[PDB]
Design a protein around this nucleic acid. Structure first.
Lengths: 23, 120, 106, 196, 122, 183, 167, 125
RNA sequence: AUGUAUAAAAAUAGAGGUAGGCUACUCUCCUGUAUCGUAGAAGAUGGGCGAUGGUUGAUGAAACGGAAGUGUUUUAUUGACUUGUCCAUGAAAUUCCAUGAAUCCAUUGCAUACGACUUUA
RNA sequence: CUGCCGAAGUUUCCGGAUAGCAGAAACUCAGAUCAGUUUUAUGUGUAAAAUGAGAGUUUCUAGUGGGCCAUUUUUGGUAAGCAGAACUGGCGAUGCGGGAUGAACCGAACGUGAGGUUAAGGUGCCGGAAUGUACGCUC
């Protein structure tokens, strides 16, 4: 992070990001 | 609770209050001492004139409780040299006086009576 | 005093491994002075040994040795793979090995 | 290429990450490393950026007994040792052994001021950082976070420079004498065909 | 090991080699060709010394069927010293004529700090 | 660009040496030293001309050439002519009392707006403070370093700041009136 | 490394067109198979000539006629972006037309994050006169008095002495 | 500065199959490339990158884009050969090369040489 | 451990000199693939020739080193070795790799849940 | 205890009979037929060359009759989600390399070992492997 927030994301969060990118 | 700057609230590891900071050294000032050791005897109350400008009891008298500490003259039995190092102050060496009174020799022994009095 | 050491010095770096699996049979050896796989082709086939000491005086000697043979280069930086008669213990990671100059072809 | 029993590294002008990665590999290789002048190390990025980094590192602390949290060390040697340690398998016996084979010190103590101090070309700032780019120094960073021995180390290093320079003058004068007597002998030029 | 030796001839597998015994005390011995570094030092005459006498059977050990016994006094036979002395007599003029070879053969080779065999030319 | 250069001609100032990026300019008035280690610019000295050269530099670094050229010119002006700042005291009711100590290197100001606080301001090195006789309530700041003189003037003005009052009506303060060379 | 290829092809002869026109292109590809594939894709996208109904009559690699002479090349390109519609002209100074194409691909991929497929070469010409040379850096390379210090000078770890890193 | 990338500068090739050779920048291509040639027949005229060469201090007059023969003619006329060797840098490089090609017997003679040279260690008191 | 051999400093868009009067000279850099050291039954026995040096062991020292000085010199001896240049003997059958105080028991109360702590003896 | 063979994972009709997948027994078939395949021809369907494989039936007897995830088409869409089909896949019966860790992501499918070489992913250090090469961008 170092900023305020973790760059690394939750695995279910990544997948739904992929889903949101698809639709 | 109280202030968090005084925790952990545990017993002091020394009967005698150890100095943790001395006044800063100055080459302009000539050579003198900064600390002394005394024994608490109690306190009394005294009447003292109040020469406090701007106060409402100026040029008057008040009663103050004042602690009396007996301070018999202290005997210098040695000297310790401290050298500044990148890891702080370090005791380079210690030089003691030739003759030490039994009062200070008793410090080095838990049982001075049973001891052979072999200190120094 | 410096009329000896007919051997090249080397260090037992680690085993031949993947990220999660070790193969203790073959060990990675860093021969010093060697800097490339082309340089490691000179040391192929040489005799590398591991000299250590034990408490007992077997054969009236405090020092035992595990022999070994340089097999092939390992990477672009000049390390080599060595096969010892007894696979080296895991405690020798970073220890010193002696690479003799024989069997020589020079 | 080669090793010695003990390697003394003059960390002036080196980069924290580049030097630590080279040092960590040498420790796992089995060599003993002594990194002197740790307060003269450099870090990429300007001073304010690095200060915020460490400050944010200070924020890492438990609610329960901050004495059980991460112990923040302010000394430049302790900063460098932390960088090295994270590059080692410190949770295993092999990692613990490698750490004990390293000694990072501020300045140059007397046992190491009379020994040759090598440098790492792969970690030097002048070769690794593009000119004009902002870089900080661990000595200034440490002294601002809470290190309280910057002045004395500066004074002690000044004395070391003076004493060492006088030694070099004596050795240079001796080297001038041996250089003059070098070509004086005709045998040097007799069969110098071997390049010596 | 580390002794500089002169090669007399090639046997079926080994090299029958001996340094001048008066120089470095290396008798006529078979040495496997994989355990020898052939230096590029100037050649010396070997055609002048008889070598057909040295055979595999000649160097062979006796049967097995004591350390004060054997020894290079009792088990070192007289004629063996005769070939050895003859070999030195036939080789000494060559190493005398060419400079530094007697000094070179007396010295023993050994690696030093910073010496890399894969770069050093022998 | 491959080449970006600024050329400066030197006056009769004695030394303009830039050894180790440290400009140490010695002139008739005195000697000023400044460090230009924060700029990666070649400082070529040939005869009476100095070239500030940057090769393959970005715009941010290229802007440093002119800035370096000006500050070197400014300090060269200092060692030759010097800098002088004239400031006029402004007071409506309470006259501003100004006294000079250590030949003016420190100025302590009293009786400002009726305040009993004695504001003591020390000038930067290379600057001296004098009270002009030709003009009343006039303070003259002369020296070699233009930045030091201007910073001293700014410090004096900033200290004598009217607070919590209407600026439109309250005009008391000390302000810069004239900036230039000694001659 | 890329290789310049001269590619000539035509549709299969048929009673409708017994003598089809021979279309020739100069296009750059690592090998012949890539060059023919790019040729057929270009022919389909320009003249609507099907790959299936066509065939390749001649393929020849082209070497630089004067590879030892410094030259300046101007290249027209139709780059594809988020909108998929762009056209630029760039100038490169080097000693081989292949080198200029190599430099152009690296430049476009470095700046605009382009790819080989997003890039189509439109025209490559050799600008020989300083008058037609447009770009400032090219002009400052063709200046008669070009001279500048060398930039970015930059196993055997543990060097005993500090680097000179200068002359 | 003492070294500048300019037409007519002699350079030393450091990386590649021509390591240790002497070349002269006949023409300059751009900030990252240069065209060089050498009088020696074993060194062909070619384009090299600046990382492969080190700029030598010797600069000789040369018209831009000169052909190989005229470059050799100018090289012979200005005597660049043995002018590089006059420098102490070249002597060290050649001495290093000679030391590299030494064999074991030559190294033994060197030890006797320096042992006899070390024999004196005589200085005035 | 197998030579466990190497102490200027700073800069890198620069330094160091030499030779000069902070300024005029020219040279050097461009890594240590350097320098020191290295022949001798792990190193035998003598003889010359030529240095008049080098390497040390044991004493006796005085000067220096405080950052972790635990080491630097100068030496006055004494005992060795010397390969600096030449000689003469010896090796081997190991006949083809293996190496005085403190505590308890007592005493105190400045302390105390129990230990601990401050005393005394 | 070891070895071998090895599914269904759901239609179609009223808990089932059926079919399908897996086996057994007994038959005939090699100038013969097949095929999760492609061409050719006739108008997507029909018919006859390529390639692979020995190809067929009859009896009878076990187990299965779920779901999950994803692609594509499409039906509406809706604050925005999504909802409805079809489609073949992947899981399901299955370990292994990589993705820091993982039911669904990239490779790969398994007797016990030696050697060699790779996939996916990687080569600053933890960590096996270039602090490689060349050209740019970025503070």
């Amino acid at each position: 992070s170092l900023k305020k927030k973790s760059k690394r994301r939750t695995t279910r969060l990544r997948s739904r990001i992929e889903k949101k990118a698809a639709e | 609770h109280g202030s968090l700057g005084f925790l952990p609230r545990k017993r002091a590891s020394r009967q005698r209050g150890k100095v943790k900071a001395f006044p800063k050294d100055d080459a302009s000032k000539p050579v003198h001492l900064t600390a002394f050791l005394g024994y608490k005897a109690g306190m009394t109350h005294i009447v003292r004139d109040l020469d406090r400008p701007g106060s409402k009891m100026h040029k008057r008298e008040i009663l103050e409780a004042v602690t009396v500490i007996e301070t018999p003259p202290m005997v210098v039995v040695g000297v310790v040299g401290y050298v500044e190092t990148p890891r702080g102050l370090r005791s380079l060496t210690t030089v003691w006086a030739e003759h030490l009174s039994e009062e200070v020799k008793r410090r080095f022994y838990k049982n001075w009576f049973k001891s052979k009095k072999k200190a120094f | 005093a410096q009329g000896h050491r007919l051997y090249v010095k080397a260090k037992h770096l680690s085993f031949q491994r993947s990220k999660h699996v070790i193969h203790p049979g073959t060990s990675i050896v860093k021969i010093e002075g060697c800097d490339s796989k082309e340089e490691a082709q000179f040391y192929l086939g040489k005799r590398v040994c591991y000299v250590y000491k034990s408490s007992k005086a077997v054969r009236g000697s405090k020092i035992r040795v595990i022999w070994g043979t340089i097999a092939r280069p390992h990477g672009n930086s000049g390390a080599v793979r060595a096969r010892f008669v007894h696979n080296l213990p895991a405690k020798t990671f970073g220890s010193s090995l002696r690479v003799m100059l024989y069997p020589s072809n020079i | 290429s080669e090793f010695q029993k003990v390697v003394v590294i003059d960390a002036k002008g080196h980069l924290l990450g580049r030097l630590a990665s080279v040092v960590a590999k040498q420790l796992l290789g089995g060599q003993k490393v002594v990194v002197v002048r740790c307060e003269e190390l450099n870090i990429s990025g300007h001073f304010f950026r690095n200060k915020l980094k460490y400050l944010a590192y200070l924020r890492k602390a438990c609610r329960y007994n901050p004495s059980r949290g991460a112990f923040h060390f302010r000394a430049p040697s302790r900063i460098f040792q932390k960088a090295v340690r994270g590059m080692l398998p410190h949770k295993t016996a092999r990692g613990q052994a490698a750490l004990e084979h390293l000694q990072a010190v501020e300045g140059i103590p007397p046992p190491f001021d009379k020994q040759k101090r090598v440098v790492v070309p792969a970690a030097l700032r002048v070769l690794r950082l593009k000119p004009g780019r902002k870089y900080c120094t661990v000595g200034r960073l440490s002294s601002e976070v809470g290190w309280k021995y910057n002045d004395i180390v500066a004074k002690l290093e000044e004395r070391r420079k003076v004493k060492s320079a006088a030694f070099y003058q004596a050795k240079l004068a001796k080297q001038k004498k041996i250089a003059s007597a070098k070509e004086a002998s005709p045998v040097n030029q007799k069969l110098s065909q071997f390049g010596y | 090991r580390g002794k500089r030796v002169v090669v007399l001839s090639q046997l079926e597998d080994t090299l029958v080699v001996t340094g001048p015994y008066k120089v470095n005390g290396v008798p006529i011995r078979r040495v496997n060709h994989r355990y020898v570094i052939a230096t590029s030092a100037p050649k010396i005459d070997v055609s002048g010394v008889s070598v057909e006498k040295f055979t595999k059977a000649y160097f062979a050990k006796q049967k097995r069927s004591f350390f004060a016994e054997n020894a290079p006094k009792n088990a070192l036979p007289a004629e063996r010293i005769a070939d050895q002395k003859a070999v030195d007599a036939k080789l000494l003029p060559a190493i005398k004529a060419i400079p530094n070879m007697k000094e070179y053969l007396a010295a023993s080779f050994a690696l030093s700090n910073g010496d890399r065999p894969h770069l050093m030319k022998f | 660009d491959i080449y970006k250069d600024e050329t400066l001609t030197i006056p009769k100032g004695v030394t303009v040496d830039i050894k180790a990026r440290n400009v140490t300019v010695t002139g008739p008035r005195g000697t000023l030293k400044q460090n230009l280690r924060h700029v990666d610019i070649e400082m070529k000295k040939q005869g009476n001309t100095i070239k500030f050269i940057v090769w393959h530099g970005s715009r941010k670094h290229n802007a440093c050439i002119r800035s370096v050229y000006s500050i070197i010119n400014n300090m060269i002006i200092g060692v030759t002519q010097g800098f002088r700042y004239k400031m006029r005291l402004v007071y409506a009711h309470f006259p501003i009392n100004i006294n000079l100590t250590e030949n003016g290197t420190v100025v302590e100001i009293r009786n400002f707006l009726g305040e009993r606080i004695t504001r003591v301001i020390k000038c930067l090195p290379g600057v001296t403070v004098s009270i002009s006789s030709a003009v009343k309530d006039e303070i003259i700041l002369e020296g070699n370093s233009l930045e030091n003189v201007s910073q001293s003037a700014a410090n004096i003005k900033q200290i004598c700041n009217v607070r919590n009052k209407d600026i439109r009506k309250f005009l008391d303060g000390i302000y810069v009136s004239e900036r230039g060379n000694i001659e | 490394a890329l290789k310049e290829y001269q590619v000539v092809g035509r549709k299969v002869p048929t009673e409708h067109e017994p003598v089809p026109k021979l279309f020739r292109m100069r296009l750059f590809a690592p090998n012949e198979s890539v060059a023919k594939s790019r040729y057929w894709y270009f022919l389909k996208m320009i003249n609507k000539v099907k790959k299936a109904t066509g065939e390749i009559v001649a393929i020849n690699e082209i070497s630089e006629p004067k590879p030892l002479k410094a030259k300046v090349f101007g290249i027209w390109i139709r780059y594809d972006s988020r909108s998929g519609t762009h056209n630029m002209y760039k100038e490169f100074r080097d000693t081989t037309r292949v080198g200029a194409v190599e430099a152009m691909y690296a430049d476009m991929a470095a700046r605009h994050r382009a790819r080989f497929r997003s890039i189509r070469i439109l025209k490559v010409v050799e600008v020989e006169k300083k008058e037609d040379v447009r770009r400032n850096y090219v002009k400052q390379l063709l200046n008669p008095h070009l001279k500048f210090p060398l930039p970015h000078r930059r196993k055997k770890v543990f060097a005993p002495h500090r680097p000179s890193t200068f002359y | 500065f003492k070294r500048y990338v300019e037409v007519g500068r002699v350079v030393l090739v450091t990386k590649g199959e021509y390591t240790g050779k002497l070349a002269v920048i006949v023409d300059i291509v751009d900030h990252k490339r240069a065209l060089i040639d050498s009088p020696c027949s074993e060194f062909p005229r070619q384009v090299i990158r600046y990382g492969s060469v080190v700029l030598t201090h010797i600069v000789m007059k040369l018209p831009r884009g000169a052909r190989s023969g005229i470059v050799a003619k100018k090289w012979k006329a200005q005597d660049v050969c043995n002018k590089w060797a006059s420098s102490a840098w070249a002597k060290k490089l050649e001495a290093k090369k000679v030391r590299s090609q030494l064999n074991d017997f030559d190294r033994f003679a060197v030890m006797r040489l320096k042992k006899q040279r070390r024999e004196q260690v005589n200085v005035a008191v």
